Each structure stands twice: as C-alpha cells, then as structure tokens.
C-alpha cells in the first residue's frame, strides 16, 4: 500500500499546476510566446489561448482536466485572460505549500484564499478610473488588437483584422447611442482558402437560398427587400384550412392563390429590391413559383439573421405586403459575389457605402484549427473593446491592478487577528505571479522590475502604473497600451480562487462552515 503523506499528497496537484503554469507564464501579455502544436492528424496550429492548449494536449491528471474548465470559463464570458487565470491558480497553490510548512491546517489555508479572493475582486471596482477619452482610447485598442492577433496566432499581424476589429466597434458605437451590440460586428471564417487571404467587408455576407439548383440564380441592384409580411405562403410545419361556398368557389380559390403570387411579384417589382428576405418559411412547391418568374427570395430566415441585414442598412422592415416604400427597404452600397474558399461555393455579400452599421471581418484558412484560432484572436479583441465602449469600466492589469489588490488583502491579514491571516497574505503574494511572469519571459529582471511597482503601491493607492509588457522599460499601462476589462480581471480572480478551494478540499464529505480553531 502506497500512501502520500502531507505535502506528497498535495505535490501531485502542485506539479500538475506547475506543468501548465510553466507554459501559461510565458504566454501572458502582448509579449507572450505562442504555443505551436501538431494534432493527431498532422495538423499544425498556433495558439496563445490557454483553453486551446489545455484541450488539445492529452489530459493525464486531475488538475489538467480541471484547468480546461478554468480557462474555458474565461474566454466564454470575457475572452482574454485564459492563460492568466491558470497562472494565478497555480501561484495560489504554490504558496499553499508554504502555508502547510507553517503548520496551518490544509482547510484553514483554503478558507484564507477564498476570503482574500473576495476582497481582491471587490477592490477592483475602485482600481482604475472610469473616465476615458474616445481619441486617447482608440490608440491602445489598435495596439491591443495588433498584439492580440500578431503575437498569439498569426505571425504576420494582419493589418485588416487588427484595424477592422477596432474600427468596426467604434464606427458603429457612434451611430447607436455610444453602445455596441453583437449584431453590429461579425467575424466570418471558413476553411478552404489560405491564411494570408483577408478581405474588408463593409457590410454582411448572406448565404444564397434556393430550393433547387435548377432554378436561375438572379442578382441585381443594391436594394434589399427585408420583409416580415408573407411574401410566399407560410407553412410552419402545419396545414391550411379550406373555407369555400361551393365547388366553383374552390376552383376560384386555387386560382386566387396563383393570382396572389403574381400580385406580390408585381407589387415588389414596381418598388424595387426583388430579393425578398422573409422569416416565414414554406416548402419548395411555392418557392419555384417565385423563382420561375426570376424573383429570388430567402426563406426560413431566423430572428438575428433578418435583424442583422436590417441593422446593417439601418432601414425599416415591411410589416405588410401591401405597404411598400423606400424607407422600409435596405440601403446597400454595393452587392457583389464573394467566393467561398477557392472552389467550393459562392456567397452574396451586401456592403453599405452610406452607413457602416455592420462591419464584417472576412478571413480564410486552410485548416480548421487555424481558422478557429484566428476567430479567437478577434474574439478577445472584440470583447475587450465591446465592454470598454459600452461602459468606461476598465482595469489596467499586468502588475498595477494586481499589486493594488494584494495590498487590500494584506491589510485584512493585519486587521484580522485569526489563523487565516497568513493564508490571506499568501493570496496577496500570489497576485504578483502575473507581473512576475510578464517580466520573467522578458530579458528584464522580474524582481528588480516589480520593485518599482510595489514601491508605488505604497506611495499611492489604486495605481494605474504597472510593469511594461512591450519591453520598453517604462512602468506604465496607458503608454504601454495594456488594457483589460474591469469585469475581466474580476472573473480571473474569482475563477482562480475556485480552483484552489476545490483542490484543497482534501477528504471532507459534508460541506463545513469556516470552523474556528
């Protein structure tokens, strides 16, 4: 019988946490090193996302399995910080070992880590001012997008992706009362092309909808008929009812339905925008009737799909087939065909030259892994900017916010006369793993580099001046362009402390209170 005594039982978790943290600590910030991996199919991908590397590597340890969820919860809600959450969780565990050497009970140290995390999270509301100038904020957003794509996934830093990701959000925020929804920006990424192929889409891309390839595919002028009214008889998986006075009336009813097709065609044709986009669907039996008259229509359109085109132009949607006016039609600037891959298919792109309310980033790749990573680079860039434009709640992380939170925790360790005071101090020290790792990957001495920021934390409260991540040697975050969302840093700390509590819950079956000593 093999028994793991004390630190040996925890050493399994410590080593696994270090095994991942050793790769996460080198990927933090704009100066992070990308991780290249070859899949089981011989597919090479380049990512700097902690979630991707943890999911792609073969899991052989409980920590490696839990860390996947730790990073996944970060990109699903926040985006960036998938590597930072793991580093922080590992640092809390690494310090936990020292707490055990103090003789502090394994559960009591876990209790102290949770208490310190609560204070460190709440202290972020005061860290970093809520006043941001549109012009001054535009620059770090551009630099952030460039480093997010150019240092993490794509080594050539695509100019279009980094610039469009920022302009797509800022250009739409001004026309939407200084707010941005998810329908104003879209990232289009398809496998079948090449990674170097990137295009600027001024509007949105819509997939052509035809019930039969034998029917002619017509494309015309830059006018889109966005209709909610029934342009083709609806059939939501059910059947209509017949109400006729006589057999002759039924024959007249069959002709009446045919006449309705002709009337709807003529009514829209006299107004323009022969491409009808309707949320109502039907079978192919009526779809060929509209196509046989050379009038295409899109059927079974979802809620966000019709709203996406409607918002892209900024016009209205037609509630009734009898009421047709230019104000209820789309206002497109250029309608052209865009190729899908190189040989597979073609998509119809509707661009706007008057109101850029929907800016789409069009990227291609020859590998599913690289296209998803390219989209993730845009996901992080678009999430940070989306929150900073919607609200001015920003955190200057990377050593400034972390040291400030460390002080807030240490102060409680001195105010609280209890046994957990040492565990809380350990948490405050663990917060410094981030600036440490950011300077550890660089040529700078992390100890001497963090010395200035720590001294500044004493001199002034809630500093926005941390260590540089561009290797410039200037201790700032407003000139180094290292900005994150306030909620993002809160999520990183909240998730990391949860990991600690779960692994330092050694064998207690019933959930206890924070028992005294």
Curated annotation (Swiss-Prot):
It is found in: Cytoplasm; Cytoplasm, Cytoskeleton, Microtubule organizing center, Centrosome. It is an enzyme of class 3 (hydrolase). One of its GO terms (biological process) is positive regulation of telomere maintenance via telomerase. SUPFAM superfamilies: GroEL apical domain-like, GroEL equatorial domain-like, GroEL-intermediate domain like. GO terms for cellular component: cell body; centrosome; chaperonin-containing T-complex; cytosol; extracellular exosome; microtubule. This is T-complex protein 1 subunit epsilon. It comes from Homo sapiens. There is a cross-link at residues 186, 190, 241, 251, 255, 368 (Glycyl lysine isopeptide (Lys-Gly) (interchain with G-Cter in SUMO2)). Coiled coil: none annotated. Component of the chaperonin-containing T-complex (TRiC), a hexadecamer composed of two identical back-to-back stacked rings enclosing a protein folding chamber. Each ring is made up of eight different subunits: TCP1/CCT1, CCT2, CCT3, CCT4, CCT5, CCT6A/CCT6, CCT7, CCT8. Interacts with PACRG. Interacts with DNAAF4. Interacts with DLEC1. Interacts with SPMAP2. The keyword Acyltransferase does not apply. Keywords: Acetylation, ATP-binding, Chaperone, Cytoplasm, Cytoskeleton, Disease variant, Hydrolase, Isopeptide bond, Neuropathy, Nucleotide-binding, Phosphoprotein, Ubl conjugation. It holds the Pfam family Cpn60_TCP1. The modification Phosphoserine is found at residues 2, 322, 515. InterPro entries: Chap_CCT_epsi, Chaperone_TCP-1, Chaperonin_TCP-1_CS, Cpn60/GroEL/TCP-1, GroEL-like_apical_dom_sf, GROEL-like_equatorial_sf, TCP-1-like_intermed_sf, TCP-1_chaperonin. CDD domains: TCP1_epsilon. It catalyses: ATP + H2O = ADP + phosphate + H(+). Changing residue 152 to R: Found in a patient with severe developmental delay, intellectual disability, pyramidal and cerebellar signs, visual impairment, polymicrogyria and pontocerebellar hypoplasia; uncertain significance; the orthologous yeast mutation induces yeast lethality suggesting loss of function. GO terms for molecular function: ATP binding; ATP hydrolysis activity; ATP-dependent protein folding chaperone; beta-tubulin binding; G-protein beta-subunit binding; mRNA 3'-UTR binding; mRNA 5'-UTR binding; protein folding chaperone. Ubiquitinated by the DCX(DCAF12) complex specifically recognizes the diglutamate (Glu-Glu) at the C-terminus, leading to its degradation. Induction: Down-regulated in response to enterovirus 71 (EV71) infection (at protein level).
